[PDB]
């Protein structure tokens, strides 16, 4: 069982921190393109080892995959599986703040969410 | 080289046509679940064998892999990339009739934007 070069194992995933600006958008279809996804949270043990990621590089934020249709309604992982808050609740979450912050990104121990089309760093997985 | 039992191909692609009924994220999941993604239409060729599907399926219409994340908001296909009409437009378009219309479903020879949580059928899609 083996992950790319440059790809990191934990887990039972391969990952890339990608370390180039991107949409929420194009940081899923970069991810696509190498038969991968924006990152789902699974567990706290897959949480825990990308926040250490994430926390020691709190220059930019890591986009992931999740996101919501409605600019407020459900949040849903790229898989199309529902979001339970088992690690982290994701954060700036009254009402009008909210408001067309519909994607979601991970900056340093925080997951917050935030406009689409904003340009960040993404995180992407693949099974190992 | 080899679809699965069930699944039909063309072009490049293995196909499911899920006859059963579920919301646009449940849809995901399921295609997800086998590997897969929801049907992504990539040429004229491709929709044209799609439409010949949907066009003699239409008790029930079939939810596709393209959605928006606001209603002010363009279509991305389930990979990320960007929508263009090369084939077909998504109906129903004056403002104000597709609000909370987010996510996309074929029924017949017609696409129309719809709300997400609506339950159709489906139509799963991964490469040959
Ligand atoms: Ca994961
Ligand atoms: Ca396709
Ligand atoms: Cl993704
Ligand atoms: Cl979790
Ligand atoms: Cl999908
Ligand atoms: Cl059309």
Known sequence: QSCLPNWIM??????????????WYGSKRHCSQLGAHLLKIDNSKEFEFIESQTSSHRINAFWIGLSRNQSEGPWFWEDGSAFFPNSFQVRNAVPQESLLHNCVWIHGSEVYNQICNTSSYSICEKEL
């Open 10 to 23: 934990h887990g039972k995933s391969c990952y890339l921190f990608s370390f180039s600006g991107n949409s």
